[PDB]
Every structure is written in C-alpha cells, then in structure tokens.
Amino acid sequence: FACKTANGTAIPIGGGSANVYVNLAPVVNVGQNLVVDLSTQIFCHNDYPETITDYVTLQRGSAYGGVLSNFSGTVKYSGSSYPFPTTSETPRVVYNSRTDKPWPVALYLTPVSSAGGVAIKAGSLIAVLILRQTNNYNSDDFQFVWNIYANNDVVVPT
Ligand SMILES: C/C(=C\[C@H]1O[C@H](CO)[C@@H](O)[C@H](O)[C@@H]1O)c1ccc(-c2ccccc2)cc1
C-alpha cells in the first residue's frame, strides 16, 4: 500500500509525509462553501490484492491558520459529513486494487462572522490530514500525513 499526489509526490510502503498544493476559489461569501476536494489530489493503491485487502481511514484532521479562524468546517469522507477539525476516526475505505484510486476526502469551509478580508493567505497551511492504513492480513498500521497548502489568497468580501 502506497500513495501519491496528483503531481506525483509519493509516500511509500510504511507511510510518511508529503505536501499538497491546491488552488482555491479566490472569493467566497457568507453562506457559501470553500470546497477543497482532495479526491483529485491524493491517490493510493494496494500492492498485493491477490492476498491482502487494505483499509483506509481519516484518523484525524486538523485546521490551521485562516481556515480555523475564518471558517466553520466539515470534512466529507466518501460523501458523508463529519466535524472538521475532526473529533473521531472515520469509517474505513476498502483498497483492493493495484490501480490507484482517490482518497475520498473533501473539506467544506463556510465563513463565520469574523471572516472579512483575506481569510486564507497564499502559501499558508490549511490542514493536516492523517490517512491511516491497516489490512486484513497482519498488523501493519501506517500513517500517511498530508500537509495541505493554499496556492492563492481567498478573500471574503465585506
Ligand atoms: C506488498 C506487501 C505489503 C505491503 O502491501 C500490502 C498491500 O497493499 C499492505 O497491506 C502492507 O501494509 C504493505 O504496504 C507484501 C505483504 C506480504 C507478502 C508475503 C508474500 C509471501 C509470503 C509472506 C508475505 C508480500 C508482500
């Protein structure tokens, strides 16, 4: 089991860490979500599906900088919404193919009343997401840690 970003940044067997750089809608108003769709950014596969099935959760996710300050968040895992920053581990997604498939995570961030002006700075950390991989074969239990960065400012009009 290993993962990679869309631009090819890999985390190998055993887990590790990588940075992910995302484009964000530049203007977001109150009552709208800023969507950060990581299912187009992070992909994983099973290296031995003949014999092993892998299980993958979002073990935890945290918000940083302008994201935590200026927005109310949820994370959708396989299309289902949970609190973000997280307070528990998600259900487990089955990875049973050597063909890469997305990690099905997306953040939905809606402005709170104190948002106004530059709500997310270009270059800033928006989230750290911990992908946990186990399997049905042995005790392997590995963490793939993704630091998510904004490619551009996001402004909330006032
Ligand atoms: C590829 C592999 C393990 C990796 O790939 C597995 C499948 O994705 C993961 O579940 C593991 O955590 C690890 O990332 C592997 C496991 C067992 C054997 C094996 C084969 C014959 C006899 C004993 C063990 C070979 C490869």
Side-chain angles (χ1 to χ4, degrees):
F1 181 90
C3 302
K4 59 179 74 189
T5 66
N7 57 309
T9 308
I11 306 178
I13 288 169
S17 52
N19 300 318
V20 186
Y21 298 90
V22 299
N23 300 318
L24 299 174
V27 174
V28 189
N29 290 284
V30 180
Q32 298 172 336
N33 302 305
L34 176 64
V35 183
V36 188
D37 183 6
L38 297 172
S39 76
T40 57
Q41 303 300 316
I42 298 169
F43 302 83
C44 302
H45 72 278
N46 176 332
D47 284 299
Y48 196 13
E50 296 81 2
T51 293
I52 304 184
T53 298
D54 291 317
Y55 303 122
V56 170
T57 63
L58 175 67
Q59 185 173 35
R60 44 165 46 88
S62 313
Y64 294 90
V67 170
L68 182 65
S69 295
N70 295 313
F71 302 83
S72 165
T74 50
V75 56
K76 285 190 197 166
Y77 200 65
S78 298
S80 298
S81 295
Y82 299 93
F84 179 74
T86 64
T87 52
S88 67
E89 182 162 28
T90 63
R92 73 194 190 179
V93 172
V94 169
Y95 282 75
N96 64 347
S97 181
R98 208 166 256 116
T99 298
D100 280 1
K101 74 169 180 177
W103 190 38
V105 178
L107 308 176
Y108 293 77
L109 306 170
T110 193
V112 294
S113 68
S114 59
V118 178
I120 301 173
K121 293 192 66 162
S124 71
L125 183 70
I126 63 173
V128 176
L129 306 174
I130 303 189
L131 181 166
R132 176 185 174 209
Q133 172 249 326
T134 56
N135 68 36
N136 68 350
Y137 176 78
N138 60 16
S139 68
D140 283 2
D141 200 326
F142 296 130
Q143 287 138 330
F144 292 72
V145 181
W146 309 95
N147 282 21
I148 317 301
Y149 294 95
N151 280 345
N152 56 274
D153 289 346
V154 177
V155 175
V156 174
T158 54

